[PDB]
Amino acid sequence: IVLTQSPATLSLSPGERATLSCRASQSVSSYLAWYQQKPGQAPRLLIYDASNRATGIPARFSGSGSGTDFTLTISSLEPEDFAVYYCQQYEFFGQGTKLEIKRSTVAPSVFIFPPSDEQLKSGTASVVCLLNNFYPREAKVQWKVDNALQSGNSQESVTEQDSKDSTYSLSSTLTLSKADYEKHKVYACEVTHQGLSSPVTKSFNR
Amino acid sequence: QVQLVQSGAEVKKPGASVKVSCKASGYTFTGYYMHWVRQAPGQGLEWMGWINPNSGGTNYAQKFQGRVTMTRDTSISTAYMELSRLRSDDTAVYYCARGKNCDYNWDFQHWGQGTLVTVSSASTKGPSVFPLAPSSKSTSGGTAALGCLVKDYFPEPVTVSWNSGALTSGVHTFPAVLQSSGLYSLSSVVTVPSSSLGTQTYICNVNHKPSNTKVDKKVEP
């Protein structure tokens, strides 16, 4: 049995209706569970036997379907409803649908931090670029050193969608040795995001 | 109320074996199967097998046959999962779970809190904590950003607070990234009014329990 969930990612406004699909390849059964998982938590059972609401689950959650196709519906999205959703039949789970809150576009506030004297004393230089409170999630950060594009010497991380304002934040770290760091002058992060008319460059002179 | 309480986080070298326990309460232990499901970081759910505590009978997922062993001790209402010949891709959160109903037992209404098992050849190491000082390059409007870089620790997790938890608004602590060194690194930032940079003190508090490491770093302009 292979469980195919659709869509991979679903982005909707609160108050709106969500419909998630689960297709079960070799199933002639009417059993299906759905689960909600929030960041840092165990999955929480929502629906069982395709259409019964589990313990403590609100009326806006409903399920239907049987055999090969199933659906999970959320009647009017509350902001607490936004999470990763999995379906399951017997031992098999679907890959997960990420349900995120859709909101108005917000451009990133961009900040850049040179390496600390203390790290420099230890022989290493990490430069950090912060993209604070933006939406949508899609954002491209590029590191330029004396106008030269860097690759494979940076790592990035993104926060979960904020439960208050539904924005994201991103942290990107470019790491060099102290010796390499001092061979160059201008350190820059170039940010591309749909909220920005043109790419924004924040930079500093070592 | 049903409770499933699992043992604590573990760290293992490739080739080692790990054993995790799950203690059940609030119901008849022998009346339901216990399942084990794991979730690798950033990924989905995988069933590993079940055990029938009434008999000791088990059913393991095909991929774990010959590697996994499930047992139970009825007298302390506890189920165990042992996984041997570990590899780095066994790094995951392992959960015990109990089905809601009996004739079809796969609706997991009850889950343990999860046990993180990190599989790696790295050794435990406290983080270095470096200030991310606020300046004109970290200022927009009358708002500035500052933070901490918590670098080169193993294993996960670390906790980061600001002013001992007195400062929460505007704080973002980022998910750790696993570096090519086999060590983790993360940053925690906070935005504050730029006028307050001269009067309010900002300290980042980094706690890394696996190495009993606690570190307070003052972040100044």
Coordinates of C-alpha atoms in Angstrom, one line a residue, chain A residues 28-159:
Chain A
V28 CA -10.0 -2.0 -0.7
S29 CA -10.5 -0.9 2.9
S30 CA -12.5 1.9 4.6
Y31 CA -10.0 2.4 7.4
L32 CA -7.9 5.6 7.4
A33 CA -6.5 7.8 10.1
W34 CA -5.3 11.4 9.8
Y35 CA -2.8 13.1 12.2
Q36 CA -1.7 16.7 12.9
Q37 CA 1.9 17.3 13.9
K38 CA 3.1 20.7 15.1
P39 CA 6.8 21.6 15.5
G40 CA 8.4 19.8 18.4
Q41 CA 5.4 17.6 19.3
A42 CA 4.2 14.1 18.7
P43 CA 1.5 13.6 16.1
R44 CA -2.1 14.0 17.3
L45 CA -4.9 11.8 16.0
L46 CA -7.6 13.8 14.3
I47 CA -9.7 11.3 12.4
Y48 CA -10.1 7.5 12.5
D49 CA -12.2 5.0 10.4
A50 CA -12.0 7.7 7.7
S51 CA -14.7 9.9 9.2
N52 CA -14.9 9.7 13.0
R53 CA -13.4 12.6 15.0
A54 CA -10.8 11.5 17.6
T55 CA -10.7 12.7 21.3
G56 CA -10.9 16.4 21.8
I57 CA -11.1 17.2 18.0
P58 CA -13.3 20.2 17.0
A59 CA -16.4 19.9 14.7
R60 CA -14.6 21.9 11.9
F61 CA -12.5 18.7 11.2
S62 CA -14.3 16.2 9.0
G63 CA -13.2 13.2 7.0
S64 CA -14.7 11.2 4.1
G65 CA -13.8 8.5 1.6
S66 CA -13.0 4.8 1.1
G67 CA -11.2 2.3 -1.0
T68 CA -8.5 4.2 -2.9
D69 CA -9.4 7.9 -2.2
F70 CA -9.9 9.8 1.0
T71 CA -10.3 13.5 2.0
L72 CA -9.7 15.5 5.2
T73 CA -11.6 18.8 5.4
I74 CA -11.2 21.7 7.8
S75 CA -14.3 23.8 7.6
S76 CA -13.0 27.2 8.7
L77 CA -9.4 27.5 9.5
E78 CA -8.4 28.7 12.9
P79 CA -4.7 29.7 13.2
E80 CA -4.1 26.7 15.6
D81 CA -5.0 24.4 12.7
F82 CA -1.8 25.1 10.8
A83 CA 0.7 22.2 10.8
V84 CA 1.9 19.1 9.1
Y85 CA -0.8 16.5 8.3
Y86 CA -0.3 12.8 7.7
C87 CA -2.7 10.0 6.6
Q88 CA -2.2 6.4 7.5
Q89 CA -3.6 3.0 6.7
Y90 CA -2.4 0.0 8.6
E91 CA 1.4 0.3 8.9
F92 CA 1.8 2.8 6.0
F93 CA 1.9 6.6 6.3
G94 CA 1.6 9.2 3.6
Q95 CA 4.5 11.7 3.1
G96 CA 2.8 14.6 4.8
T97 CA 1.0 17.8 3.7
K98 CA 2.3 21.1 5.1
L99 CA -0.5 23.4 5.8
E100 CA 0.7 27.0 6.2
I101 CA -1.1 30.3 6.9
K102 CA -1.4 32.6 3.9
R103 CA -1.0 36.3 4.7
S104 CA -0.1 39.6 3.0
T105 CA 3.4 39.9 1.6
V106 CA 6.0 41.4 4.0
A107 CA 9.6 42.3 2.9
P108 CA 12.5 41.1 5.1
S109 CA 14.3 43.5 7.4
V110 CA 17.9 42.6 6.6
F111 CA 20.8 42.8 9.1
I112 CA 24.4 41.7 8.8
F113 CA 26.9 40.8 11.6
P114 CA 30.7 40.8 11.2
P115 CA 32.6 38.1 13.2
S116 CA 33.2 38.8 16.9
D117 CA 36.7 39.6 18.2
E118 CA 36.5 36.5 20.3
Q119 CA 35.9 34.1 17.4
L120 CA 38.6 35.9 15.5
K121 CA 41.0 35.2 18.4
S122 CA 40.1 31.5 17.9
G123 CA 41.2 31.6 14.3
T124 CA 37.8 31.5 12.6
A125 CA 35.3 34.0 11.1
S126 CA 31.6 33.6 10.8
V127 CA 29.6 36.3 9.1
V128 CA 25.8 36.2 9.8
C129 CA 23.0 37.6 7.7
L130 CA 19.5 37.9 9.3
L131 CA 16.3 38.2 7.3
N132 CA 13.7 39.1 9.9
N133 CA 9.9 38.7 9.7
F134 CA 9.0 38.1 6.0
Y135 CA 6.3 36.4 3.9
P136 CA 6.2 34.3 1.8
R137 CA 8.7 31.8 2.8
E138 CA 10.5 31.7 -0.5
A139 CA 13.7 33.8 -0.1
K140 CA 17.2 33.6 -1.7
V141 CA 20.3 34.7 0.1
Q142 CA 23.6 35.0 -1.7
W143 CA 27.0 35.8 -0.2
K144 CA 29.4 38.0 -2.1
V145 CA 33.0 38.7 -1.0
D146 CA 34.7 41.5 -2.9
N147 CA 31.8 41.1 -5.3
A148 CA 32.7 37.4 -5.9
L149 CA 29.9 34.9 -5.4
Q150 CA 30.4 32.2 -2.7
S151 CA 29.1 28.6 -2.7
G152 CA 29.5 25.7 -0.3
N153 CA 30.8 27.8 2.6
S154 CA 27.5 28.9 4.0
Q155 CA 24.6 27.3 5.9
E156 CA 21.1 28.6 6.5
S157 CA 18.2 27.9 8.9
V158 CA 14.6 29.1 8.9
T159 CA 12.2 29.5 11.8

